[PDB]
Amino acid sequence: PKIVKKHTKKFKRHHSDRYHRVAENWRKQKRGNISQPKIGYGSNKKTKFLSPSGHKTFLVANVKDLETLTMHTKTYAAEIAHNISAKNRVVILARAKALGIKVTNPKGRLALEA
Amino acid sequence: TKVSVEGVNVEKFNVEYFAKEKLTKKEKKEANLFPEQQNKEIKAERVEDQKVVDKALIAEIKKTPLLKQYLSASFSLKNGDKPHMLKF
Amino acid sequence: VEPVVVIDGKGHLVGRLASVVAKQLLNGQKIVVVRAEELNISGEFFRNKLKYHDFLRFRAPSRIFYKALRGMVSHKTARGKAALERLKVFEGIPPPYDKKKRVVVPQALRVLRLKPGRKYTTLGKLSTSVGWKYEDVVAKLEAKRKVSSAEYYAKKRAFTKKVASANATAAESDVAKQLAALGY
Amino acid sequence: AHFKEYQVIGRRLPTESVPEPKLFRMRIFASNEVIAKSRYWYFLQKLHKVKKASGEIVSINQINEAHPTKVKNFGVWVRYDSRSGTHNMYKEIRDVSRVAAVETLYQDMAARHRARFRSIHILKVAEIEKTADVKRQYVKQFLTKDLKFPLPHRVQKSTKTFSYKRPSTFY
Amino acid sequence: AESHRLYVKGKHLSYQRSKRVNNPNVSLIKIEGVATPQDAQFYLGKRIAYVYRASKEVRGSKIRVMWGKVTRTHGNSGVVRATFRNNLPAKTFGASVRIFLYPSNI
Amino acid sequence: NWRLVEVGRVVLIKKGQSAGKLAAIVEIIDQKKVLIDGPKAGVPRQAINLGQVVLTPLTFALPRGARTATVSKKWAAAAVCEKWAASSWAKKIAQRERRAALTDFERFQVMVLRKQKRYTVKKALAKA
RNA sequence: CUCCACACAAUAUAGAUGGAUACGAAUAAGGCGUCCUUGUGGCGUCGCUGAACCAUAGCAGGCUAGCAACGGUGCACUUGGCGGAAAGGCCUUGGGUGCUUGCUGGCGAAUUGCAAUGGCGUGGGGAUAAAUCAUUUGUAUACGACUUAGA
RNA sequence: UGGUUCCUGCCGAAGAACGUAGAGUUAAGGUGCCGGAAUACACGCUCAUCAGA
RNA sequence: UUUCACUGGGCCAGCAUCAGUUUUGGUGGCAGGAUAAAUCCAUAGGAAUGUAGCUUGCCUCGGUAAGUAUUAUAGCCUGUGGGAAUACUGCCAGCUGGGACUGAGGACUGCGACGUAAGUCAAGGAUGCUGGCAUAAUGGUUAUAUGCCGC
């Protein structure tokens, strides 16, 4: 469907630029030119957790995790975890293209030689 | 400004007549990776249709004064041309 | 509709013309305002003299009208500065603008806005009364300009009289009647 | 807004053993019927001790002009309140119709006397039929034989931005 | 021969605004030779292009175009509201913007 | 030479339901308002403010407070319809109406005939 | 001002895509034309908007054919005059050489497939009129500065 | 006395009650220019040698 | 494996037909009023900001004036009678046009309507057609600029 986002930017603390010690996470203060988080900005329940590709992401550590997305190919998309070694990433890619599952992050820690 | 369409037997060609053509054999493997550019020409049947319509249309035009030269000249908007006021 | 609009200042009001021009510069129309010394002010000379006085606690009429105009535009913005950069203001009509037509702004005309039987004020007399020592220089150039312009207009009227004669002898022709048929 | 004449009749209610009271009739100039009825009660209480609950309206009516083509002349009695004190005033009006004269009269009274539509209480509008009963000089100014004068305000709305003509009140 | 204009040029006046808050989404257009809203009814829904010239040559030309359309009238003077695909950079106030005749009713 | 507001001054209502119809001042109301009737043009007898109307330099004799049947009689006997049509100003008004009435092939014929007339005039020019 | 090296250029920046298209004054008055008694004369006209006027066909404007006129018009010249308020433009002579839609012809356009805009800087050398520093003077001078004079 | 460490939702005292947007219509307030929007219209009054808004 | 034929995803557009909200037009038929009033026509009186006529006086061979003179060589007003029309106000489950925003939902069920019938449909929320796109389409990031707001 047509994904509505309701808020493109981020929600930052008041005076977060004014000091380097102050973080940028949302912390409630305890003018109105600051966008404050609230439940009205909560996205549509169908559209929630959707990539710009239109899938829901799913972290995959190994091939047995990849096989759990066998039936739900058009709905989900596999994302390789950040700490997977490069021997296993090519096996995961070959298995996923065999399964026909869209990998969100191919070409991670990998190159194509000859 | 109006002309009579009645001299022309327009009905023959249809929406399907203007369907843009397709290729086969995956363009015959791009002639084995060598491109060729002879396909630019127009089919003669289109030209013949244009001539057949054009004769009976010019025969209508030549009865009216200055209409050939009107169709030959293009159109633009001059200074002060106000199309909401400009009755057409 | 015109790239550069040339506006005469004779017989006009200060603020209404300033409002019109200030609107058009923010609209992007390039404007030169000429014969600025002949701008007219509502009220008597003396009131307006006191107004320039208590303001003063630049003497040229162009500076005066520029002041009035600059007050209406938000001058501190970059957009207002570009709008002011579109503007030119001149007392008299220097070249090249002497050879071009000067439009008027009817909603800022003195003779239309003022009720008859009211005192007004000439801006050049005001500037000379407050220390702009150039008004006699102006009228001297303007007299020569009016001489040459009367020469130009006398030539122009004779040539257009010849054009009128040629259009008169062009009449009764069938192409003229076909223009009449089309309305011209 | 633009007013209207109204024949308004009130009859304050026939009580037990009092049948058919006297059907008091007035003529109200009002933009609608509703404020006409309100003004009718506002006069009827000033006539005598009625209330809108005490009586009722018989018939609300609009009445047109019989001859709205002829320019008639009018003598009008007005009473109103310069807030503390009241006083009457007699004005003479040259007008085609009655209700336009009453319109112009309200405009003039609000101009010269700062009086509202509620403060003004119309006593009488009647046509002055023959000439020289026009007591006022300014209406009599237009009673002359063969009257001619030029237009004032030759200034018109130019409707355009710039003029090439250097225009002139050429009249 | 001398002219090739199939549009009406008109000034990008401003954004829709109060005294303190301006809306960049709706833009305000002055169409030349239009003083009445009834004349502006002719210009409703019409396709608008802002033409400008860039330094770089994006696709065979250095000239780029924003598009959009007239939505509704604005005020008494025939000033016309407009909505574009991307909003205007607002340094284009008083700029000449092209208003095309398609979608033509006539 | 002045026009004057007066009885028998034929006028032209530039703004209103008429928006240009020949009428005549039958009677004056004041400096602001008058009584007019335009029964030949079709605008009825009515009171009007003078701003909505313009005076024409044409006039004729019209009785004071004359009724509409008498008005149309004196109108036709004045024959100022023809005197109006003979005026170059009404010719210009009809011309600017006809220019709005133009068609694009008509306007193209205007272009062509302007070319041909200009050719003939420039031959007539530069010989005299 | 001039010889090598390389970066755009044959463009545009507040907004090009028919033309900024020139009397002056008066307004309870003007203008134009005309006549005479040249006037504060008479007559007629006009305004009441530029909604005007001028330009405007041709591949974003092709290639040719004649008919007619001695027109129009571009460009480069050429002749002379006018323009100083910031003239930087205007007007003219004379040819040249284009186009000419004033008229009539004859071939080309497509498929872009139904809208998607579609000389100037650097870097390194060469040449030059002066200026400065230095010397010197004292009408000057806290110092600058001033100021002589010197191939 | 001063300080007292994450978020969101719900409940919550001693002209207009405001989730997030889109579109429309309006209250008040305005509509010479800044400044968006009639230098609208109509009728009267005021020329002030620092009216008045 | 080979021949031949057909077809292709996603996004962004434009158009058509719809639906929902809205805005702006054009146009028709009604119903009420004092059954509009008026106007127009018919009649009778009246008067003047008295038309024709007459008298008189100054005076450019005839202009004026001030009497007469109530229609004559203008007319007006009022009264009464006849006939509509239109204004205003309201209604239409009258017709028709333009523009904007929206496309939620997701086999069928329901209310309908048109249809003799079978079927269809604007009827329990949008579908159809076409275009562009891999040296993509397009989208994002920053720094600057613009405008508005911000102690």
Swiss-Prot record, chain A:
Q: Where in the cell is it found?
A: Cytoplasm
Question: What GO MF terms are annotated?
Answer: structural constituent of ribosome
Q: Which domain of life is it from?
A: Eukaryota
Q: Quick one: a GO cellular component term?
A: cytosol
Entry's family note: Belongs to the eukaryotic ribosomal protein eL32 family.
**Subunit-level organization:** Component of the large ribosomal subunit (LSU). Mature yeast ribosomes consist of a small (40S) and a large (60S) subunit. The 40S small subunit contains 1 molecule of ribosomal RNA (18S rRNA) and 33 different proteins (encoded by 57 genes). The large 60S subunit contains 3 rRNA molecules (25S, 5.8S and 5S rRNA) and 46 different proteins (encoded by 81 genes).
Task performed by this protein? Component of the ribosome, a large ribonucleoprotein complex responsible for the synthesis of proteins in the cell. The small ribosomal subunit (SSU) binds messenger RNAs (mRNAs) and translates the encoded message by selecting cognate aminoacyl-transfer RNA (tRNA) molecules. The large subunit (LSU) contains the ribosomal catalytic site termed the peptidyl transferase center (PTC), which catalyzes the formation of peptide bonds, thereby polymerizing the amino acids delivered by tRNAs into a polypeptide chain.
Recorded protein name is Large ribosomal subunit protein eL32
Q: Which organism is it from?
A: Saccharomyces cerevisiae (strain ATCC 204508 / S288c) (Baker's yeast)
| Upper taxonomic lineage | Eukaryota, Fungi, Dikarya, Ascomycota, Saccharomycotina
From Swiss-Prot, chain C:
**A Gene Ontology biological process term:** cytoplasmic translation
The cross-link Glycyl lysine isopeptide (Lys-Gly) (interchain with G-Cter in ubiquitin) sits at 162
This protein's UniProt keywords: Acetylation, Cytoplasm, Isopeptide bond, Ribonucleoprotein, Ribosomal protein, Ubl conjugation
Coiled-coil residues are none
Q: Where is the protein situated, by its record's location annotation?
A: Cytoplasm
Enumerate the GO terms in the molecular function aspect. mRNA binding; RNA binding; structural constituent of ribosome
Q: What is this protein called?
A: Large ribosomal subunit protein uL13A
In the UniProt record, which is one GO cellular component term? cytosol
Its job: Component of the ribosome, a large ribonucleoprotein complex responsible for the synthesis of proteins in the cell. The small ribosomal subunit (SSU) binds messenger RNAs (mRNAs) and translates the encoded message by selecting cognate aminoacyl-transfer RNA (tRNA) molecules. The large subunit (LSU) contains the ribosomal catalytic site termed the peptidyl transferase center (PTC), which catalyzes the formation of peptide bonds, thereby polymerizing the amino acids delivered by tRNAs into a polypeptide chain.
HAMAP family on file: Ribosomal_uL13
Additional remark text: Present with 43300 molecules/cell in log phase SD medium.
UniProt's post-translational modification comment states:
N-terminally acetylated by acetyltransferase NatA.
Matches recorded under InterPro entries: Ribosomal_uL13, Ribosomal_uL13_CS, Ribosomal_uL13_euk/arc, Ribosomal_uL13_sf
The domain of life for this entry's organism is Eukaryota
PROSITE patterns cross-referenced by the UniProt entry: RIBOSOMAL_L13
What gene, per UniProt, encodes this protein? RPL16A
Give all cystine bridges in this chain: none
CDD domains with a match to the protein in the record = Ribosomal_L13
UniProtKB/Swiss-Prot annotation, chain E:
Question: Could you name the domain of life of the organism this protein comes from?
Answer: Eukaryota
This entry carries the following GO cellular component terms, namely:
cytosol; cytosolic large ribosomal subunit
Gene Ontology BP, a term: ribosomal large subunit biogenesis
Residues with PTM N-acetylalanine: 1
- Alphabetized Gene3D superfamilies for the sequence: translation elongation factor selb, chain A, domain 4 (2.40.10.190)
Tell whether Cytoplasm is among the UniProt keywords. Answer: yes
Indicate yes or no for the key word Lipid metabolism: no
Supply the InterPro entries for this chain.
Ribosomal_eL33, Ribosomal_eL33_CS, Ribosomal_eL33_sf, Transl_B-barrel_sf
Q: Fill in the subunit field for this protein.
A: Component of the large ribosomal subunit (LSU). Mature yeast ribosomes consist of a small (40S) and a large (60S) subunit. The 40S small subunit contains 1 molecule of ribosomal RNA (18S rRNA) and 33 different proteins (encoded by 57 genes). The large 60S subunit contains 3 rRNA molecules (25S, 5.8S and 5S rRNA) and 46 different proteins (encoded by 81 genes).
The protein depicted here goes by the name: Large ribosomal subunit protein eL33A
State the species of origin. Saccharomyces cerevisiae (strain ATCC 204508 / S288c)
UniProtKB/Swiss-Prot annotation, chain F:
GO terms in the biological process aspect are: cytoplasmic translation; macroautophagy; maturation of LSU-rRNA; ribosomal large subunit assembly; ribosomal large subunit biogenesis
Q: Which domain of life is it from?
A: Eukaryota
* Any one annotated GO CC term: nucleolus
Instruction: State the similarity comment.
Output: Belongs to the eukaryotic ribosomal protein eL14 family.
Question: What is the role of the protein in this entry?
Answer: Component of the ribosome, a large ribonucleoprotein complex responsible for the synthesis of proteins in the cell. The small ribosomal subunit (SSU) binds messenger RNAs (mRNAs) and translates the encoded message by selecting cognate aminoacyl-transfer RNA (tRNA) molecules. The large subunit (LSU) contains the ribosomal catalytic site termed the peptidyl transferase center (PTC), which catalyzes the formation of peptide bonds, thereby polymerizing the amino acids delivered by tRNAs into a polypeptide chain.
This chain's protein is named: Large ribosomal subunit protein eL14A
Q: Where in the cell is it found?
A: Cytoplasm
- Example GO molecular function term? structural constituent of ribosome
What else the UniProt entry mentions is: Present with 45300 molecules/cell in log phase SD medium.
Keywords recorded for this protein, A-Z: Acetylation, Cytoplasm, Ribonucleoprotein, Ribosomal protein
Q: How is it modified after translation?
A: N-terminally acetylated by acetyltransferase NatA.
Query: Where does the secretion signal sit in this chain?
Result: none
